[PDB]
Symmetry: C4
Subunit: 252 residues, 4 copies
């Protein structure tokens, strides 16, 4: 029976800085990625943007950069679904988890907020970076895609945990950033045409909050439930089926 918090949460100066790092990181994540999306969507020259490929790179490349910078401070989650998966495997206390998830959402809101402020017209005209079910797919397909996508991501996160090194003043495992960055990249390549790719409830929520349309709000549940389920299946797979929690993957 896992306690609500532990002594690492009483190291308040570090715990506060971990929270800030998650907040600022998720802000930057959303700023760079949604600005990339809007910059793409608004372009009038045919084949004169960074393209869907550029967009998939923005999301994957930013998770690489942000986990690189924050792994030693917070554990580098940038993603309620990642925090949720790790909480389920008891690598993160409930109190740390909820503090991280709030930070991530508020940061996502602020980041999309910044994109709207910089490019209000194109932002509103071209869908505000929001996830929703694309034409021709049903909600069940959307949800399945969000589950398997988040699974790929959360399973990569588990395999990328360092069993010996932890974020400052915590037991939160350090994460190897490149493979997690690449997993995000891969999932976007597959999933952009179906939902835009969520796999990150905060990323989806921030976009929904700022864009604020009925259609986007109606689909929003898929981007919470899908990722949380995917994360849960990844935690069970890694912990229970493969028994791989002590394994250190050799990065490349």
């Amino acid at each position: 029976p896992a306690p609500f918090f532990d002594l690492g949460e009483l190291k308040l100066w570090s715990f506060w800085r971990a929270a800030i790092a998650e907040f600022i990181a998720t802000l930057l994540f959303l700023y760079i990625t949604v600005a990339t999306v809007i910059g793409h969507s608004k372009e009038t020259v045919v084949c004169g943007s960074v393209g869907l490929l550029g967009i998939a790179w923005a999301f994957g490349g930013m998770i690489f950069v942000l986990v690189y910078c924050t792994a030693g401070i917070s554990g580098g989650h940038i993603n309620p679904a990642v925090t949720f998966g790790l909480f389920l495997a008891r690598k993160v206390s409930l109190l740390r988890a909820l503090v991280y998830m709030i930070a991530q959402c508020l940061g996502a809101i602020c980041g999309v907020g910044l994109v709207k402020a910089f490019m209000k017209g194109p932002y509103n005209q071209f869908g505000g970076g929001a996830n929703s079910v694309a034409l021709g797919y049903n909600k069940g397909t959307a949800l399945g895609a969000e589950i398997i996508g988040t699974f790929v991501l959360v399973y990569t996160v588990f395999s990328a945990t360092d069993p010996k090194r932890s974020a400052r003043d915590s037991h939160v495992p350090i994460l190897a950033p490149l493979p997690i960055g690449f997993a995000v990249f891969m999932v976007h390549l597959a999933t952009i045409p179906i939902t835009g790719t969520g796999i990150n409830p905060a990323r989806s929520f921030g976009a929904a909050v700022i864009f604020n349309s009925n259609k986007v709000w109606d689909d929003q549940w898929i981007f919470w439930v899908g990722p949380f389920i995917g994360a849960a299946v990844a935690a069970a797979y890694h912990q229970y089926v493969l028994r791989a929690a002590a394994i250190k993957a050799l990065g490349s």
Copy 2:
């Protein structure tokens, strides 16, 4: 004569988990990559997809990710031709090889099956992620391109083996993931116009089973014979010509 199995295969709990890791990995491989292919093919706006470059990245990048995740558990093969090459070099017993190959084929079938379940009309309309000889090329060319493409891959795999570290409870060498993923990305840049790029019999077999068309079944043998030959040539070249089995590469 190499024995059928060794004491590592009597470590039943680990060996079962290695098979599962190969099953799940190959399922995820086919799912991400075939969904990317179908997603590209169905897009109605010109230059509005991830393009053939995005497709090549999906195959090379997923191999990087999956070998990264599974090297420590199974050895990270995700590919009967890789398993076969290592079997010929005696790094894998016959029993482990067959179990890995079966696991990989079944995984592939399941991953493509999942793409079809998600997008049935576009899945069948745009060719099902299947390999075949493209218009304008002959069988000999397709076969040669699969041999050499598999050679580049399997030579890289051999170069990437860690001579001191093995998968859990085994002597299956750990593999450096990024050069292998890049090798796959590279071969796809070259071979997509010829065959769609096989270099992986389970990848080609999973798509042939789910798509189930005469043309795809007709060409299927190329995607077994080509990679198996390329793998044997790479094994022979690494082991006998260069004698580089103890060599530890860094990247």
Copy 3:
């Protein structure tokens, strides 16, 4: 209060070689990237160029390559804003900072000059690799984008410092090149549509000097002020808020 220089700047042989490395690397940075940009802009076959994605790669990949080559010699800055940020965190002395910034600017001018010499017509006709505010955006937006873009870069730079290893005969920290190259790549994907992406006053200045147009000079201050502000905030955030100078990523 910081001293103008320290004993490391009296190792003249090394200090001069560090300046040359920053000079040559920034030259190479501008040549490869602006040649890519002009090469893309002049192509006549629609979809026949490396695309805006290729251009974003040229900027990010060159920083990866150049920092890799020079981190052990100069500290691998290639960028007055990176140098400024490090100077503010007192990782570099005022004298080394100025010598680096001057070397960077002159390197950038020489690299852009070389592109022009190789392809004068296309260079002039397609904008000279210069940064300026793109149509439909205002000065505030361009400035904001440059602040936050440079913040991403310089924050990654600080996370990428090695706390135990330094450039030859100095205390300038070695930098891990790939995260920094990737941060440059990422910022381009977002910012190319807004300003072309500056996040580097020497890269912006090199192009302005060689292209020499009214609009480009008029906007030039943004590409000094924006990155210098972004760098200062990244330095304050890393050192004062996160207190992370001892950490190795």
Copy 4:
């Protein structure tokens, strides 16, 4: 002062295998990259190929892969200009250099030969992967682009040399492969519009020999002379100006 050969060249089993590794690697380099070029050029559907970006990746990524595989056997040169630069810096003997340059040239010819054998029609119709001076540039510009191009590559090679580890039975330094591959990738982004990008006399020679057109042969001297000069200048810069031969670069 440098002797023609040293005792490492008397270790014949290893020297032979190093020559073979260079031969086979250069063959693979030319096959993958030229097949990529021809596959791109023949595409009938607009924006339906890997594009110029994909071609640049084929060249840069194959150098990464091949230097990864061969560094521990031959030193991973794959390129007479690289071998030449290292020779000038006395890192490779004259005998080893010439054996390597011949192996590379023979390898390149075979690699391109394989592409033509597989797809003769489109190979011949779309220019055979040959380098030559593009419309609107003069010989001086192409020469200069090749010099600086090869300078970027060879200076990166020198920076990537491991000062303590060498190829099997030799003193030829091991090379860190990813920066060298990325250098190749960067030079292609800039130089494809000017010459196709040579920066490698074997790669240029192999394509000229197999494509075999009068115009291409006319330009071929640029692709020997430009790279050899760039390599020489890179060697002088690294060795004499920066005195960097003992520095170990930490790769990322």
